[PDB]
Design an enzyme around this catalytic site. Structure first.
Site, PDB file in Angstrom:
ATOM      1  N   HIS A  41       0.880  -1.125  -0.082  1.00  0.00           N
ATOM      2  CA  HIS A  41       0.064  -0.163   0.113  1.00  0.00           C
ATOM      3  C   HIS A  41       0.840   1.232  -0.109  1.00  0.00           C
ATOM      4  CE1 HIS A  41       0.121  -0.682   4.623  1.00  0.00           C
ATOM      5  NE2 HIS A  41       0.620   0.701   4.461  1.00  0.00           N
ATOM      6  N   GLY A 141       2.928   5.850  10.392  1.00  0.00           N
ATOM      7  CA  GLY A 141       4.214   5.853  10.010  1.00  0.00           C
ATOM      8  C   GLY A 141       5.237   4.286  10.448  1.00  0.00           C
ATOM      9  N   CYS A 143       4.261   1.073   9.448  1.00  0.00           N
ATOM     10  CA  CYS A 143       3.850   0.060   8.634  1.00  0.00           C
ATOM     11  C   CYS A 143       5.259  -0.185   8.025  1.00  0.00           C
ATOM     12  CB  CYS A 143       2.760   0.510   7.388  1.00  0.00           C
ATOM     13  SG  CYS A 143       1.341   0.669   8.119  1.00  0.00           S
TER      14      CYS A 143
HETATM   15  C1  LIG Z   1       0.850   2.542   8.433  1.00  0.00           C
HETATM   16  N1  LIG Z   1       1.935   3.131   8.653  1.00  0.00           N
HETATM   17  C2  LIG Z   1      -0.324   2.436   9.258  1.00  0.00           C
HETATM   18  C3  LIG Z   1      -0.142   1.750  10.474  1.00  0.00           C
HETATM   19  C4  LIG Z   1      -1.407   2.119  11.299  1.00  0.00           C
HETATM   20  C5  LIG Z   1      -1.642   3.604  11.968  1.00  0.00           C
HETATM   21  C6  LIG Z   1      -2.283   3.329  13.289  1.00  0.00           C
HETATM   22  N2  LIG Z   1      -1.974   1.967  13.761  1.00  0.00           N
HETATM   23  C7  LIG Z   1      -1.443   1.403  12.814  1.00  0.00           C
HETATM   24  O1  LIG Z   1      -0.867   0.097  12.850  1.00  0.00           O
HETATM   25  N3  LIG Z   1      -1.332   1.573   8.496  1.00  0.00           N
HETATM   26  C8  LIG Z   1      -2.320   2.276   7.645  1.00  0.00           C
HETATM   27  O2  LIG Z   1      -2.664   3.329   7.775  1.00  0.00           O
HETATM   28  C9  LIG Z   1      -3.392   1.328   6.933  1.00  0.00           C
HETATM   29  C10 LIG Z   1      -3.501   1.508   5.568  1.00  0.00           C
HETATM   30  C11 LIG Z   1      -4.849   1.684   5.141  1.00  0.00           C
HETATM   31  C12 LIG Z   1      -5.585   2.078   6.377  1.00  0.00           C
HETATM   32  N4  LIG Z   1      -4.778   1.452   7.560  1.00  0.00           N
HETATM   33  C13 LIG Z   1      -5.155   1.622   8.680  1.00  0.00           C
HETATM   34  O3  LIG Z   1      -4.563   0.843   9.444  1.00  0.00           O
HETATM   35  C14 LIG Z   1      -6.612   2.071   9.071  1.00  0.00           C
HETATM   36  N5  LIG Z   1      -7.544   0.930   9.293  1.00  0.00           N
HETATM   37  C15 LIG Z   1      -8.378   0.667   8.820  1.00  0.00           C
HETATM   38  O4  LIG Z   1      -8.863   1.365   7.922  1.00  0.00           O
HETATM   39  C16 LIG Z   1      -9.325  -0.248   9.168  1.00  0.00           C
HETATM   40  F1  LIG Z   1     -10.268  -0.167  10.149  1.00  0.00           F
HETATM   41  F2  LIG Z   1     -10.140  -0.767   8.325  1.00  0.00           F
HETATM   42  F3  LIG Z   1      -8.493  -1.483   9.722  1.00  0.00           F
HETATM   43  C17 LIG Z   1      -6.449   3.216  10.140  1.00  0.00           C
HETATM   44  C18 LIG Z   1      -7.898   3.630  10.373  1.00  0.00           C
HETATM   45  C19 LIG Z   1      -5.474   4.313   9.806  1.00  0.00           C
HETATM   46  C20 LIG Z   1      -5.840   2.608  11.458  1.00  0.00           C
HETATM   47  C21 LIG Z   1      -4.161   0.528   4.517  1.00  0.00           C
HETATM   48  C22 LIG Z   1      -3.858   0.426   3.166  1.00  0.00           C
HETATM   49  C23 LIG Z   1      -4.902  -0.529   5.070  1.00  0.00           C
END
Ligand SMILES: *C(=N)[C@H](C[C@@H]1CCNC1=O)NC(=O)[C@@H]1[C@@H]2[C@H](CN1C(=O)[C@@H](NC(=O)C(F)(F)F)C(C)(C)C)C2(C)C
Ligand SMILES: *C(=N)[C@H](C[C@@H]1CCNC1=O)NC(=O)[C@@H]1[C@@H]2[C@H](CN1C(=O)[C@@H](NC(=O)C(F)(F)F)C(C)(C)C)C2(C)C
Lengths: 297, 298
Positions: A41, A141, A143
């Site tokens: 992603h 940040g 991921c």
């Molecule tokens: C990457 N750095 C982040 C890590 C996140 C931030 C909060 N805690 C974490 O582990 N990952 C993301 O931004 C991923 C990314 C899009 C959305 N996302 C999410 O983790 C979101 N979750 C969801 O949308 C849900 F509920 F469906 F799981 C978020 C709301 C920002 C926590 C993708 C491509 C999955």
């Protein structure tokens, strides 16, 4: 002598973390040999809504990538491997350690090296829950942060971070691109099943407490293994295949698993204002080998 | 959730060595041509009181065995420096990192590299308690394990483990030989005095529970800072000098510090059966700067 959630040393993993950027998205990647692995992603043009990863791969441009560590590496090849992006780069990591790939089953523990924009920030221990998630502390940040574990001087990479479910749980991939728990790398509301706590770990935790001088929860009572396993299936607890994994711990504390199994059923209703190594509730985060090694080396 | 984390250990691991003298096996910190280690290694009987200078006069340097992986470091000179044994070895560590020596104060967090007979085994964060102790996990052969903390890329060596008190509290020294808390490196009965809870770190802990959706401990009542400090002087809590350190946390959570100070006095007598971040009592091992960084990064 004490019990703490410990992490294994991360010296072999830190030199393999890199920064990975595409357009306006930046995350971490794992540099082994002449290849970088990171969540796919990073190439999504809009993480707002559900992503069409086939469209994003068709519109990809290698020049838009940047992979750096303090040293910039150009990307020569990009390909999907499951939910993971695999990038070939023009330089081989001189600090590539001998390693293997593995997946983590429920109740097992491993180490998280949390990183931010290619900078390893902290390292801590986690435990795989039955629904394929861990109670991490990943934020924006993080991921691409790597999970690992060492067994008999063999380094295994087992986890890469991806997302956080609505209930706060954290979903990640193995390093073959297979997401734990069957979750999708999509920003959509995905549910987590009910958490089944590991009785093997809860028993080991109670043994750790006994070794540290805690004893108020063991009485002159002892519950049978079949009687416990019947209680386990209606209160979301793993069934104990046997008591063989606690023979040493039982001889040193002089307390049988059956005595500990009765305490679990009693402690499940609450501690009543008492503590077990500061915990106010049962804890299935320490495996038996984790405990045995920390208490006796 | 709120988890105790540790700064990575890549810079510290290659400086850990195995030091053995007689029947004692423990760890040492190899910096340049100097290997620091607890001085009790040179003692023949760790069960009875030790005459340290009499053992220093009987110190035959050929009996030392400093080691790392497969390098054998011959000891050429030995000298006391506080509660620490400073060895001069015939080889400089090629992996010596840029470092300084620092002293941890009460209520400050740092990291522990728990090493076992010279082998780095595990990494975890600890906190310094008012009496100069920490609450970790040390067993036989882990003496000499190193405490460290990095600030603005500056590596500091701050702790070296020495002993465990009867209450499980762990005692160590700085790298200059000053024992934290002033305890002696002797196998004798040594009491830890009254522990004093860092109220800065409890307010930080309660804020982290508010970010985690746990808000049962907050009511509508408030409590002045001056009135909390009066209560802290007689309940073994430190006084609060300012509410400013929590101005970010108070804004994001919607609860002033004074409302959680009232929570402290209430929860000090017992949680009534409930829990907070899986804890059964108040926890003070998390500084405000720790909580903010773990919750919000930057
Ligand atoms: C990457 N750095 C982040 C890590 C996140 C931030 C909060 N805690 C974490 O582990 N990952 C993301 O931004 C991923 C990314 C899009 C959305 N996302 C999410 O983790 C979101 N979750 C969801 O949308 C849900 F509920 F469906 F799981 C978020 C709301 C920002 C926590 C993708 C491509 C999955
Ligand atoms: C050194 N590797 C050990 C580390 C210990 C082992 C259990 N947990 C630890 O932190 N420490 C020692 O060998 C020191 C050393 C002699 C005895 N000792 C102790 O830590 C003992 N404690 C005390 O005598 C007490 F309680 F008074 F502080 C022990 C009973 C083994 C815990 C010397 C020179 C103090």
């Amino acid at each position: 002598s004490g019990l703490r959630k410990m992490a294994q040393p991360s010296g072999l993993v830190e030199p393999c973390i890199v920064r990975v950027s595409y357009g306006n998205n930046v995350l971490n990647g794992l540099w082994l040999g002449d290849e970088v692995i990171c969540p796919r992603h990073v190439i999504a043009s809009d993480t707002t809504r559900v992503i069409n990863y086939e469209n994003e791969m068709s519109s990809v441009r290698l020049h838009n990538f940047s992979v750096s560590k303090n040293v910039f590496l150009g990307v020569v090849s990009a390909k999907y491997k499951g939910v993971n992006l695999v990038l070939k780069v023009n330089q081989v990591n001189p600090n590539t350690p001998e390693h293997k790939f593995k997946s983590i089953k429920a109740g097992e523990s491993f180490n998280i090296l949390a990183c931010y924009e290619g900078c390893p920030g902290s390292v801590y221990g986690v435990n795989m829950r039955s629904q394929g998630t861990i109670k991490g502390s990943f934020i924006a940040g993080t991921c691409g942060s790597v999970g690992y574990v060492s067994e008999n001087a063999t380094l295994y990479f087992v986890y890469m971070h991806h997302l956080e479910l609505g209930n706060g749980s954290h979903v990640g991939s193995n390093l073959e691109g297979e997401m734990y728990g069957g979750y999708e790398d999509q920003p959509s509301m995905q549910l987590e099943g009910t958490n089944v706590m590991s009785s093997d770990n809860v028993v080991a935790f109670l043994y750790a407490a006994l070794i540290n001088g805690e004893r108020w929860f063991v009485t002159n009572t002892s519950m049978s293994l079949e009687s416990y396993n019947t209680w386990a299936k209606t209160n979301s607890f793993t069934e104990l295949s046997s008591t063989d994994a606690f023979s040493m711990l039982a001889a040193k504390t002089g307390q049988s698993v059956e005595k500990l199994l009765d305490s679990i059923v009693r402690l499940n209703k609450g501690f009543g204002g008492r503590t077990i190594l500061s915990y106010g509730s049962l804890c299935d985060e320490f495996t038996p080998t984790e405990v045995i090694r920390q208490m006796y080396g």
